[PDB]
């Protein structure tokens, strides 16, 4: 409690200044959210459309949308119905409110995952080392039950059961579904979910650095030119 273990720094394929997200890794990581996390955890800020051009073709995304049941607004009778999802629907809330979520999780509310990378210090490093960090308590530690030991969490007692282990799911691409591999992929997706802009921003960064490489010596040269009149000048005092 009130101790440390701050995450180490894993060499993500997107750590580098000009390095984009691995989009194949995002695709796998989505799968990890879909099959594992989405039972407990919402992600209210992603819609099926957002996967298009990122990790899924347009109709692939449509397939994924059609797979879910969503409520739709009042019909003729003034009744609510269910339908298949479209691209336009946001990824569905696993419970109809937070209190319902709590009842289902021994009184703990699972955070929405939209921003989770962004709203926890350490981001991907934190979350990765969380999922892969579960260990048996040290000698002398006894946790209230249904709260698990994890050295990377504040206080070390987390109300989340270790959600991740080998072959916990099947990969579209068929990548070896080892525990560490699935924690990487889900983290990659969780970064993208928190910051869709990651790649565009990094592209612009490059173009900004380039333009500034041009413009900074250029304007600096303009400055020196004008000021050369003054820099060169020699003064002479000549009283009679």
């Amino acid at each position: 409690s009130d101790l440390e273990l701050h995450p180490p720094s894993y060499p993500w394929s997107h750590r580098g200044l000009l390095s984009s997200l691995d989009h194949t890794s995002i695709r796998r990581g989505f799968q990890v959210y879909k099959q594992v996390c989405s039972s407990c955890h919402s992600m209210d800020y992603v819609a099926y459309r957002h996967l298009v051009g990122v990790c899924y073709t347009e109709d692939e995304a449509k397939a994924l949308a059609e797979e879910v049941e969503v409520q739709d607004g009042p019909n003729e009778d003034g009744e609510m119905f269910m339908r298949p999802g479209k691209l336009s629907d946001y990824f569905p809330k696993p419970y109809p409110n937070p209190e319902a979520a709590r009842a289902a999780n021994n009184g703990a509310l699972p955070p929405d995952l939209s921003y989770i990378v962004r709203a926890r210090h350490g981001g991907e490093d934190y979350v990765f080392s969380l999922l892969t960090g579960y260990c048996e308590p040290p000698t002398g530690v006894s946790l209230r039950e249904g709260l698990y030991f994890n050295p990377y969490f504040p206080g070390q007692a987390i109300g989340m059961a270790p959600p991740i282990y080998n072959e916990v799911l099947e990969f579209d691409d068929g990548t070896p579904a080892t525990m560490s591999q699935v924690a990487k992929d889900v983290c990659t997706f969780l970064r993208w979910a928190a910051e869709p802009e990651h790649d565009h921003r990094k592209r612009m960064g490059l173009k900004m650095l380039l333009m500034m490489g041009l413009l900074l010596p250029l304007v600096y040269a303009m400055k020196r030119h004008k000021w050369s009149v003054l820099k060169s000048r020699k003064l002479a005092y000549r009283p009679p």
Binding site: A119, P196, M204
Partner: protein, 378 residues
Amino acid sequence: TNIRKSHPLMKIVNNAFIDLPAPSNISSWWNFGSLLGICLILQILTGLFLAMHYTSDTTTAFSSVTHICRDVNYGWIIRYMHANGASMFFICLYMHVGRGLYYGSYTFLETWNIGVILLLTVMATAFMGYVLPWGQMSFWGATVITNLLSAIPYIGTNLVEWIWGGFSVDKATLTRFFAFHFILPFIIMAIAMVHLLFLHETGSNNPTGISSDVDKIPFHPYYTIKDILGALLLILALMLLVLFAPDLLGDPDNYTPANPLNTPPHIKPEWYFLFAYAILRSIPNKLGGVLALAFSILILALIPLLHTSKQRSMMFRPLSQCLFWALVADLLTLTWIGGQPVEHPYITIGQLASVLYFLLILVLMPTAGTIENKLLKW
């Protein structure tokens, strides 16, 4: 004859920015005024764009901002700009105030006090802007800080509740903070107009501190080029943040919607208020801490009277120079302390830093001025 010199509107612009006699020798430290202007324009534009997309209802507000960042075209870059923009503005502000102190520019009294007001006004602005997203820090930050006005005896409780427009920071507070945050930059522009108007009566100081009438130069083109160069460098900096490190200067709790039932582990305001947070936190008593916080800022207004040196600028004042940099480092320390939880050793580091701060301004640097005077046989 010549339009630039006659026409009612062009005359002003000419007198202000083209043919204005500037000293030959103003340094990079005089860049900050123009840069502050840019900061101000920048915030207004980026601000205006954001405001075409944002809503100030407790329920919609957090998501409207994230909507800007997900679904509005280029909304992300605009938003991060307006946020890093706010940091760049405070950097420019503190640099600008630095130059004032070191070079004795504060002798220009009217200019200077206007400036103090500019500072306060930008402070109010940024405080209320930070609330607008309705994140965890936004909310709990705004709550703690506004509550200090509760420590005002007699009227404190009533006064804070009237600001809020209820019994806590809630729907009515956010909607009014949106309003205030919008109109304040406008008022800042006018105050800044006036800030300049008074400066134009005296012309600029320079680093020697010695009158420069015998060596002035037309503003254009010497200082037109030079301000542009500075603005490039500001843009280089701004965009380095936005495009490489957009979250570097912020707190992550501000990605977690505001929740009146769950208080964050460490509550801090933005970095540009940390020195004052740490002074406030040093005092046991709550009204004490308030009056210290206010004095840490309003003291700016007194510094003109505390000047002892026969020389205007610190250029030729070694003892004063050391003390000046001491104050600067102390403010770095006050900032560090203000970002730290209230535990040993930080409680005591903070107390010391707070003492040192007031000690320097009110006693040490006055003294040094005088010691220097005696060292010079005046």
